[PDB]
Amino acid sequence: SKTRYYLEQCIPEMDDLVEKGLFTKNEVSLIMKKRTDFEHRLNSRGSSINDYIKYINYESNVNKLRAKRCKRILQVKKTNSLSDWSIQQRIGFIYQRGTNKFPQDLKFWAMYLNYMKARGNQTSYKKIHNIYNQLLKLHPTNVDIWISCAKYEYEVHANFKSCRNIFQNGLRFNPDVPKLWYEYVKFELNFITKLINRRKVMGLINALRGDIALTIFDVCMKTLGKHYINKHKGYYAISDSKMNIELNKETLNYLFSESLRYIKLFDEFLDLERDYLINHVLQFWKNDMYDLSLRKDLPELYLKTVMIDITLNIRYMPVEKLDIDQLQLSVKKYFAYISKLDSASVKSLKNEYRSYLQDNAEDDPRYKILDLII
Amino acid sequence: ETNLKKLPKLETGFDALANKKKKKNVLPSNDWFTLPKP
Amino acid sequence: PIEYLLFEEPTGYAVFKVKLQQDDIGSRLKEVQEQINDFGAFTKLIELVSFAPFKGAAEALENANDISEGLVSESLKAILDLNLPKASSKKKNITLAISDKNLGPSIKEEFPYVDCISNELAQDLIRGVRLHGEKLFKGLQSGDLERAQLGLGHAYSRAKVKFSVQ
Amino acid sequence: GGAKVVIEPHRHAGVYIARGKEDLLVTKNMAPGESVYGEKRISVEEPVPPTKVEYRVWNPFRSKLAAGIMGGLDELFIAPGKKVLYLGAASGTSVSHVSDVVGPEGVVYAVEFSHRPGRELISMAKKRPNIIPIIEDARHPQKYRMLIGMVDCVFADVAQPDQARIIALNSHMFLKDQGGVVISIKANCIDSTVDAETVFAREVQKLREERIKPLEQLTLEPYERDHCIVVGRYMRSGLK
Amino acid sequence: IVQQNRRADHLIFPLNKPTEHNHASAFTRTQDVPQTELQEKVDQVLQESNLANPEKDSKFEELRTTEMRLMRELMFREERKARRLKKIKSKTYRKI
Amino acid sequence: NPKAFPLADAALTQQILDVVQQAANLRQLKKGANEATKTLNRGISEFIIMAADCEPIEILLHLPLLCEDKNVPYVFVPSRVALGRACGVSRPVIAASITTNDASAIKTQIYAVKDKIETLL
RNA sequence: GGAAACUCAAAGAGUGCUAUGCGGAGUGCGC
């Protein structure tokens, strides 16, 4: 019975904690009673994570009562005894036992992580990196592991080198999930605006545009199309006309819905060449992968691509006097697209009409241009 | 510095997964190789 | 000196660390060949440390093809360079225990800091972990192995024989 | 071809005797309403609404395991719980009977190297769930280790003269300890020069030097010339 | 060292220290080479304009109660660690 | 590996055709595709010979799927009229099968031919 | 005299079950 070994591992801290006057033996025997029951339920057979959770909760509560009677009776913050580190180090020991016995549930993994973050005032990312490593190895497929690890060591440590390393590692392990690609681009623009405004701070007190986001977007679209087309047609590549064409257009549908999500939460970034990068996104979406989405099928996608091509220059505000100066490109594009499209002529005309209706003495020439657009 | 505050942020499910609670309910309560015995 | 082993399953790859070494001279003894049949004394040898499942069943068939031809695939490359520690110059070459001498030289070429062992000891604890199987993972997977290898078996047979669809 | 025959459980579980005037040997079908091979099926009616379930006649002149059964083996290891690795599964001649004597719960990993019997084997295998078709050469169990897990009996109907190395490699890779080994030996395909039980003695000795302890052999003489069914168990620990 | 080994109570036996190497972490590239296509593309974009923390040393070159807050929140990892070391040495030279 | 794969070269073709001729004179040979598959599923067939220039090829290519199932060896030869002349019969045969018989006088030649064609495959 | 159980007592076998080991740093060395 190793429960006896743990139970008399915990004796010396309560020995010193009793011989200095904060508890008495008549209640340290009570906490020893409940600790005995908890240890038995823990390393018995058929145990559970809820037993580990209640043990953690009880030990944290007796830690808080220890600090409370420490500042009440002794009127000090700590008594530099053995107990003060001991009780949380055995909390961490309980956490370690529970992760080794039950590496399944990310709830217990996550509260181990959260307790070690909150202890992170004292304790170490030397300790954090090990548990993130073994958690990452036990779950390579789960994406929130990589995302929470990157969020921690970029929003405390801000080590962009390790964040690039673990994002490339996460995309190496699963280049299938759209979310990890999406948040890789999100971190890329996050630190790219960080160092643009950092050199702006340097320029105040005294190249690196979105080509990285372009490259990872291109490989994102290629890999995502490959993995959607391999997610469908499970074991055998189906060979006919219409199902092959339908699977290619279904991949193109899902992929360009994803690039639309890339655009529509790409424009949150204002401190960079947002219009030039959205133009690069549409230019990469122009040439197609065995489908030709513009002139051939996916005509609804071609219509939304045309409206995005107009609105990427037409990105403006209510104070639109510079838009009254530079809407000649908008009128030229709307004319050159109405001279191409057949019934998407009517669709794009109604869409540009509703977009200009969203755009609308300064209203007087605006009313003139509104009658021009109507 | 206001833009650096309003920069968008990476999204997980982890601390929600560690903080959130349990709320739901509980509801209360031949062999293939055997010949037909004649 | 067998520090890690790689077990290839229908659902995905697994990599186990070796806590205690099996005995090398008495490996043909009754009391040693029965501890790979006792599960509670086989887990004193082998700890699971990583398990990357195949994303899709198409990738499952692809990895089965690449292992059957002895090649290294990219998910295997990913799990190996995640788990295996980089060594120094020639001191302490790290060691896998794999199941075939044809997968040997290919991952030796992909990882010159890794050494591959496939002897009787390696095949011994390989068949131990194959016997116990899904009890090692304690539920850390998305898949049941018998039905998974049913689907993978019909797929691999069909792709090997070029069975027509029309 | 239309008369009525009673059924009875055999000594081995899963296999049944069909006693009529003459008395057939039969097994309980996995796929009712069909005959794969060209055998006769005896259909019985269980009386709840009444069910109609059928039983495929196992031909001992066309499957060496059924030759060994009604020649009399003291025990098999093809029980209706077990899993069976069928080395050298040519067609649905014997693998169908081994499949449905295993039953709906356990798997028969049937292997095969040749391609035309392989493709009619997978076309057989779509109709019953519990068999796994393998289209690999049996000499390299490494290239199908991906997909069979810890089988607890092996049958070997391979007919090429490196049988001992075949069964040794496959049993080392996949057969669990104290597991069953059933071998069909064909003397004219091992070597035609020397006589039948001389090559049976050679193969028995190669088995027990590969620490498959042989318990039992049978000549199956009224059905086929110069074959032998050798039943042994993988000892792996304490051959003595 | 053999007198101090015969004067020992217990001998956990591989006495020459096991030269175990740096454990495999996901936090560093373990071969220092491009592994895949996105890795080689991101490195060939990053090789022309990145930092060996030269610009990090330049931006960490510093001296109002919010400009220091903005510079600290826009600092980098190695700059923050080196500045923490320099401020720790400064506080050790200043206080008691 | 086109469709009729184990196609014999010239010398092995000639020795299997002469053993075919003495088998036919000994009345140990059954000739033609459907008599061949009939003796194949009777089970008395030592090895089978198929002429791989027939019109078309599938009419005998049905025979490998039975013969390699029932474990008898099978050879292709290059000419139907060569097989017909070697069977000792007026029309071109395309398939031929040696019935097993222990009262044969050609047994050792049969076995030598069988060993050569099994090493061919 | 034969038969119901959550009637109990005593043995046996099988299936399971994990059966399951001063501190942050900083300071010079250890490749």
From Swiss-Prot, chain A:
GO biological process, one term: maturation of SSU-rRNA from tricistronic rRNA transcript (SSU-rRNA, 5.8S rRNA, LSU-rRNA)
Location of the protein in the cell: Nucleus, Nucleolus
A GO-annotated cellular component: 90S preribosome
SUPFAM superfamilies documented for this protein: TPR-like
Keyword Coiled coil: no
Repeat recorded as keyword: yes
Stretches forming HAT repeats: 86-118, 123-155, 158-190
GO MF annotation list: identical protein binding; snoRNA binding; U3 snoRNA binding
Top-level lineage group: Eukaryota
Keywords from the UniProt entry: Nucleus, Repeat, Ribonucleoprotein, Ribosome biogenesis, rRNA processing
Subunit text: Component of the ribosomal small subunit (SSU) processome, or 90S pre-ribosomal particle, composed of the 35S pre-rRNA precursor, the U3 snoRNA, and at least 40 protein subunits. Component of the PWP2/UTP-B subcomplex composed of DIP2, PWP2, UTP6, UTP13, UTP18 and UTP21. Interacts with U3 snoRNA. Interacts with MPP10.
UniProt function note: Component of the SSU processome, a pre-ribosomal particle required for the maturation of the 18S rRNA from the 35S pre-rRNA precursor.
Family, per entry: Belongs to the UTP6 family.
Note, other: Present with 7520 molecules/cell in log phase SD medium.
Protein name, as recorded: U3 small nucleolar RNA-associated protein 6
Source organism of the structure: Saccharomyces cerevisiae (strain ATCC 204508 / S288c) (Baker's yeast)
Gene from which this protein is expressed: UTP6
Swiss-Prot record, chain C:
Other facts noted in the record for this chain: Present with 13500 molecules/cell in log phase SD medium.
Localisation: Nucleus, Nucleolus
Annotated function: Required for 60S ribosomal subunit synthesis.
Organism: Saccharomyces cerevisiae (strain ATCC 204508 / S288c)
Full protein: residues contained: 3 to 168 of 504
Official protein name in the record: Nucleolar protein 56
Assembly and oligomerization: Interacts with NOP1 and NOP58. Component of the ribosomal small subunit (SSU) processome composed of at least 40 protein subunits and snoRNA U3.
Record-stated family: Belongs to the NOP5/NOP56 family.
Curated annotation (Swiss-Prot), chain D:
E.C. number: 2.1.1.-
Main location: nucleus
Region (Helical): 195-227
Region (S-adenosyl-L-methionine binding): 93-94, 112-113, 137-138, 157-160
Family to which this protein belongs: Belongs to the methyltransferase superfamily. Fibrillarin family.
Subunit details: Component of box C/D small nucleolar ribonucleoprotein (snoRNP) particles that contain SNU13, NOP1, SIK1/NOP56 and NOP58, plus a guide RNA. Interacts with snoRNA U3. Interacts with MPP10, NOP58, SIK1 and SOF1. Component of the ribosomal small subunit (SSU) processome composed of at least 40 protein subunits and snoRNA U3.
Protein's name according to its UniProt entry: rRNA 2'-O-methyltransferase fibrillarin
Organism phylogeny: Eukaryota, Fungi, Dikarya, Ascomycota, Saccharomycotina
Gene of this entry: NOP1
Residues of the full protein shown: 82 to 326 of 327
From Swiss-Prot, chain E:
Function text: Involved in nucleolar processing of pre-18S ribosomal RNA.
Descriptive protein name: U3 small nucleolar RNA-associated protein 14
Source species of the chain: Saccharomyces cerevisiae (strain ATCC 204508 / S288c)
General remark: Present with 1470 molecules/cell in log phase SD medium.
Compartments reported by the entry: Nucleus, Nucleolus
Organism superkingdom: Eukaryota
Subunit structure, interactors included: Interacts with snoRNA U3. Interacts with MPP10. Component of the ribosomal small subunit (SSU) processome composed of at least 40 protein subunits and snoRNA U3.
Family statement drawn from the similarity comment of this UniProt entry: Belongs to the UTP14 family.
Gene: UTP14
Whole sequence portion shown: 301 to 408 of 899
